[PDB]
Design a protein around this ligand. Structure first.
Ligand code: CT4
Ligand code: CT4
Ligand code: CT4
Ligand code: CT4
Ligand code: CT4
Lengths: 208, 208, 208, 208, 207
């Protein structure tokens, strides 16, 4: 059929990175799930935390679909060639440091999977981080300019070990992670903006 | 009967990011409003503060207008495809750090709203920041190259809560925030440059 | 024509990489540093962090147009026009431009470019804690154009040395003097003109 | 006989930087080998180490091959004109800092070689760094978005000293370096991602 | 042919990614470090923060032009020209060019580039606090071009060492010797020429 070069060419032909792939007249269903990899530099005085994580992002874009009958059903494409959710962490106090090659996976049916590793600083509750019950830091992520009728965010509830990929060499340890969906409204505008809230319950590891 | 692809497309046909959309001979009306999200660093000796805020900027651009009678009346567009006010913080001692996706919301009537979240350090009065009455840090923001006749800056007076969006985990707290208007002239030229004096009356949270 | 046409023509004539040497002779570039602040200062290492507005002027005949029935001046991205390759010889960090990179172009070809710069220099910091104060020398000039291509001369004028100096700074400006110079180097036989700006300052609140 | 220009041009005309050089659906065999050069900023408390190494990377793309009969059999080419494996250090806690020109080396038989010098922080076991047995820091490097069916990583078990290129001025010393191979699956996909695991064994040089 | 014409020409015939090899002979590139300032230093970790002007010269005939009735020198952005792919072999931080990135091109095809660079190296600092001082040796050369493709010779132009060094620094230059050398590895049989810049300095006596 066609080769990976043909698939990419077609993409750049039918893709519109600056236009949201609004299916029918309904918002794009962007799924977000954070995989905590490390917890660095914590300050209980300034309520700040340096965190490394994998932002597993997904959504569909039918304008990139193709017939993978006798050709590959998946390819890696630079995000600059694709439309990407304008996600932002509300309580983030430093721009996200993308530590991995910014490539997205695209399936022939239009399913897009972007999972960059991210290091970033947040302003959250760090209190009790050294107590047995630990602290609970809450990360809010969601579109920055698209409201509920354009983009919906939902956490892909996939029963897994909160610290499955979490470093064993960190001074801290995850106790639990729960991801809830929310929808806030602002005075700037009459519409609401969906967002996912990830609650990181961690603490400093004791001693033998 | 046009979709978002048409809107963005048409926008790029009439948009002149490097040209100021001055209607006839009157200046461009820019509404500026800062929404303090956090106060990270504060130095009583050097009188410097590291702040985080949502700079709500507004202005109209008729050349971007379009009939939305049968299409979305709004779309998010990269600020690189639109002209944007050359606002600057006169007492900033560090370059602005935009923590959010650089997208603007453009309304079918040409209205433009850009609200980036910024972290920036300033030089201002920090004295009394540890007192009951707290400290008052004023931030002067305005066009850097367009004088009063070309660009005008007015605060988006919207009597709301000063700390409505302020972080609760900060070591400081907002006492009050007033945003007035100013018109200062300089040496370079006899033209007067308009600015907005945001007065952030804040103090260190005392409860220990 | 409108401002769109003025900026348009500037894109046709302007050669951002071709020095506007008018009829075989150097280009007259004036430079005036408007010290705004003095941040971190180390006497042990002799290094200082300084914020200032580098007021740069010069003429580019190629840009001149007819302001008979059109705006006399327009702001244009410095990337759309030739700009001096000024450099600070005793600079120890890249020049951090805190303001929008726009220059003021007058219909007669006169160009004004005044960015706010945050930089770290290597200079005599000793005596900063004394009455006479310390004097820091800033040598600025073209990095690749010699005396026959660029002539850098301080915009001498009975201006106020502390006119725009932050009142909230830990230091106070005692005196600012600007001496012009012309040095030759061990690479080329030609002479490179420079401008030395002496910044006399000291700590405030010292025991009298 | 063709010269370097002709050769480069040939590469640009056939090379697909955003397309993996797959040969009949078999995966691209990618070889990795880190030549540690220096170890800096070690922290046994937080288990973080800064490492400087030469990531020797090798793979093939026979579509770029040419007849070096009477013409150069090798040329340097900007990696932006070539397809480069999207390798990533899974345990890195800082984006890679490339300290050298980003040029590759293409050989007349389609073999491509890229060896950038990198400085990067990692989260690994550091306990024992000040002991005779030293510490063992395992670094995992492998394709970030291409699974084993698309890319395969294999450590060149070539004979060479461990601290051969290692700085003698480093506060540490390499006791031994062993490169293994892995293939992990993730909650995203059923396919596996091959990665080379380098185990560095070093200890604080004790001049006693 | 005025400057606009010159630049146009250069920018139109310059192949930034194609090494300008004259016939079969390698490209003769000259390297000269002019230490402008020695910042932070650490004898414990053997690391120094140096500032130096990297004088780099070479030729590219393809850029030549008759300067009889026109200028014989123009400033051109290095991004428009092919530039030697030098790298400090023992650098532990990427080079911070603090000056405009422009080269000087003479009508004969001669190219001169001297950026001011601040960079951190890993080298011998032991004795920096003594009368003898320390000798930090910096090796610079091509990264991908071997001896047959590129050659680096330190401009033997007898000049002063601390000539442009900063007087306000905390250290002082005792001596500097640019020695040409060669380097080979177990990857490739070919050798890569480089320049060893021996920096002999010590802390200035506090008094
Ligand atoms: C997600 N939070 C927002 N506002 N808020 O006040 O929080 N969104 C509205 C916009 C932000 N930037 C543009 Cl343009 S419209
Ligand atoms: C804010 N201070 C100014 N002048 N001043 O003399 O203080 N602004 C005018 C300009 C700044 N940059 C250009 Cl170009 S015109
Ligand atoms: C400031 N020191 C110079 N030479 N020197 O020998 O010290 N400048 C001349 C040049 C700098 N870059 C080019 Cl190209 S020509
Ligand atoms: C300067 N040291 C080199 N190798 N070495 O093993 O030390 N150079 C060869 C190459 C550098 N980058 C590519 Cl691609 S080939
Ligand atoms: C390293 N962890 C991964 N998945 N996971 O679910 O943990 N990697 C697979 C991918 C990474 N980026 C894209 Cl796109 S697919």
């Amino acid at each position: 059929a066609a080769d990976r070069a043909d698939i990419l060419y077609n993409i750049r032909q039918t893709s519109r990175p600056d236009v949201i792939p609004t299916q029918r007249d309904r918002p794009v269903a962007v799924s977000v799930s954070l995989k905590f990899i490390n917890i660095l530099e914590v300050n209980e005085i300034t309520n700040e935390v340096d965190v490394v994580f994998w932002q597993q992002t997904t959504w569909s874009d039918r304008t990139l679909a193709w017939d993978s009958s006798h050709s590959p059903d998946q390819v890696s494409v630079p995000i600059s060639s694709l439309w990407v959710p304008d996600l932002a962490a509300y309580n983030a106090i430093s721009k996200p440091e993308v530590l991995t090659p910014q490539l997205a996976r695209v399936v022939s049916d239009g399913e897009v999977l972007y999972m960059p590793s991210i290091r970033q600083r947040f302003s959250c509750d760090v209190s009790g981080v050294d107590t047995e019950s630990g602290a609970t830091c809450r990360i809010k992520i969601g579109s920055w300019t698209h409201h509920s009728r354009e983009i919906s965010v939902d956490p892909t509830t996939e029963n897994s070990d909160d610290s499955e990929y979490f470093s064993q060499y960190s001074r801290f340890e995850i106790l639990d992670v729960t991801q809830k969906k929310n929808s806030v409204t602002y005075s700037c505008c009459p519409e609401a903006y969906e967002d996912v809230e990830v609650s990181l319950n961690f603490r400093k590891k004791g001693r033998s």
